[PDB]
Every structure is written in C-alpha cells, then in structure tokens.
C-alpha cells in the first residue's frame, strides 16, 4: 500500500514536448524510500514497449511474463522524472532485487555518478 | 555544447501537483556522453523560493552564478527535458557545487 522504491505503477506522463517520453505507461519508482514516505512526489523512470533490447547503457530490459506487462519492455533510465503521487494509478508489480541492481547501475551511468 | 553541471533557463511547465513548474534555471545532471548524442537532457530544478536546504536532497547556490536571489538545487525535482526546452545558458556549477549535487543525487535516488 505505501509506495516503495522498485514498485512498478501505471501513470500518465502526458503532456510532453519533443523526444520526451509521453503516454500512459508503466513506471518504476526510483526515489529513496524515506522521500517516498514524506514527500508528495516520487521519482520514476519510464518503461517502454517500442523496444525490447537495451540500446544504450541506461536501458534495462524486463520480461513481460514475470512482470505482468503487455510486451517485453525496457526501463529507460535516461527518461526519469519527478511525478506527483496523484499521477500513479494501478500498481502493476515490483522489481526483483536483481533487476533493481541493474536499475541502480544504469542510474549511476545515466547521471554520471560513475 | 551541453555539459553536465551547466545551468540553463528552461520552461518546466506544464506540471501537475507538487511538481516544480515554471520558467526557471535548471542544471544538467545527465552524463556528458548522453548529453552529446541524445536529443534529451536530465536536469534538476533550481528554485529561489527558499535559500536554505530543507532536506538532504537540497543544495543551495550563492551573484556568483548569475541568479536573481540565493536559491536551492532541488535534487528531488528531476526531469528529462528535450534539448529544445533549454534557453539561455546562465552559467555552470563549480566542481565543488557539483560534488554537492552528486551527493544529494545519491541520497535522492537511494543510490547511497
């Protein structure tokens, strides 16, 4: 019931401009769990189905099977944003500790934290 | 060229709820390889409504950086912007100011 890091929620990213990721789509919570408890906002990364293989180091793949997704998808850690909690709709799932390790690594690469 | 730590003016709007909106300076935090090849940047909002860090993901910035008033870098307000959203390049953060940002970012995304 409380929003946790690694949770996967469905959320409306629109409206967007240019090469920003829009649409209603799954997103993964990447904000820290203390911030998840007190802030009115969470930090997410978009999950897309237009690709199913990682193109760049900030992409992390995820099976459709284990995660109740339409298609095999990739987590876009180069498409991350802060959302108000009201944006989060159904809770789809949550990432295994192994998948979140991939995410955290892609995140370090993404934001040049080495 | 768009570089990490640069500070640009950008239109964050439209936003929803407690998301930081408005035209304001933002600081690029995406890696410089992504800054070279992608059509998007990852930025953190800078606000002037406060000048002291309220939470560990806040970083204050001092005239030095060509800002209206002393401000805070909101590392809990991150977003990916199309490069077209960026307007004037106001400045770029000092190496030490960026060391702050790195550390607030680690806290922010539970990356320890």
């Amino acid at each position, epitope marked *: 019931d409380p929003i946790r890091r690694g949770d996967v929620y469905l959320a409306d990213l629109s409206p967007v401009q240019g090469s920003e990721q829009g649409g209603v789509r799954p997103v993964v919570i990447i904000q820290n769990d*203390t911030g998840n*408890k007190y802030s009115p906002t969470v930090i997410v990364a978009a999950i897309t189905g237009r690709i199913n293989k990682a193109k760049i180091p900030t992409h992390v793949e995820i099976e459709k099977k284990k995660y109740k997704l339409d298609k095999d998808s990739v987590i876009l850690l180069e498409q991350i944003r802060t959302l108000d909690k009201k944006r989060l709709k159904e809770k789809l799932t949550y990432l295994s500790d192994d998948k979140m390790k991939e995410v955290d690594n892609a995140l370090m690469i993404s934001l040049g934290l080495n | 060229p768009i570089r990490r730590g640069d500070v640009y003016l950008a239109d964050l709007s439209p936003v929803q709820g407690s998301e930081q909106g408005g035209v304001r300076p933002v600081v690029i935090i995406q890696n410089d390889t992504g800054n070279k090849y992608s059509p998007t940047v990852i930025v953190a909002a800078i606000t002037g*409504r406060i000048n002291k*860090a*309220k*939470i560990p993901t*806040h970083v204050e910035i001092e005239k030095k950086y060509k800002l209206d008033k002393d401000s805070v870098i909101l590392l809990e307000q991150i977003r990916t912007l199309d490069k077209k959203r960026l307007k004037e390049k106001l400045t770029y953060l000092s190496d030490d100011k960026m060391k702050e940002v790195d550390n607030a970012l680690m806290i922010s995304l539970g990356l320890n």
Partner: nanobody, 120 residues
Framework: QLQESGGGLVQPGGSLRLSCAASGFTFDDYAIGWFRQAPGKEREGVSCISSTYYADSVKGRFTISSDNAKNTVYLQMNSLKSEDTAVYYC????????????????????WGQGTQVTVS
C-alpha cells in the same frame, strides 16, 4: 511574528491547547506547526499543517488546526504523558511540512520563543 500561548502544568492523561498567533507574513503561503525540546535534547518535530503531519509518538492524541480568520494555529494535546514534557516552539516554513519530519534538516524560516509544558 510568532507568539505561542497556552502552556502550563497538566496531570498525565489531561489535555492542553497550544496557540501560535502569526503576525504579519502571509497566512496561506507558509506552513506552520510545532517543535519541542527536552533538556539537552535536539528540537524534535511534533506536528505541522499546510495536509497534516504528526510525529509517531503523538499521532492519534494530538490534533493541529488552523483558524485563518485569527491567523493562529492550534495544537490540541490530549491523553498527555510525562514524556510530552518539553519546551514547545512553533515554527513557520516557506517550503512545507517536510522540514518538521525525521527527514528534514531543521532549517525552519520563523520561530516563536518557546512555551513550557510539563506533565507529571
């Protein structure tokens, strides 16, 4: 100006109502609540309002509230306990209530001078 009122001595299980009269500064653009400090202890966040927050040890017993007409903030303290003995300071903040939590850093905008509360 923040000037708190309503402190005093109370028997365990009793009630107290604190007030914080906000002089000047926009009533709507600020968050206002209360901190408390025991002897030799750090100022602890107790409750806040913009949306409300309560520290755990006071949740369910304390009720904070706002009277916009009187530019005052009330903290109703029921079922008081000995551990609730402390100097209570109200505080106001431009940003919001997160400065009053275990995550905030304690950098608040404005303060009162503190009012004494003892329960025993």
């Amino acid at each position: 100006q923040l000037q708190e009122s309503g402190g005093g001595l109370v028997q365990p299980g009793g009630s107290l109502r604190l007030s914080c009269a906000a002089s000047g500064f926009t009533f709507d653009d600020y968050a206002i609540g209360w901190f408390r400090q025991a002897p030799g202890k750090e100022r602890e966040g107790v409750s806040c309002i913009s949306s409300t927050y309560y520290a755990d040890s006071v949740k369910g017993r304390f009720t904070i509230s706002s009277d916009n007409a009187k530019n005052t903030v009330y903290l109703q303290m029921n079922s008081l306990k000995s551990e609730d003995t402390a100097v209570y300071y109200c505080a106001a903040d431009v940003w919001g209530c997160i400065s009053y939590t275990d995550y905030g850093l304690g950098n608040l905008d404005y303060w009162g001078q503190g009012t004494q509360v003892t329960v025993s």
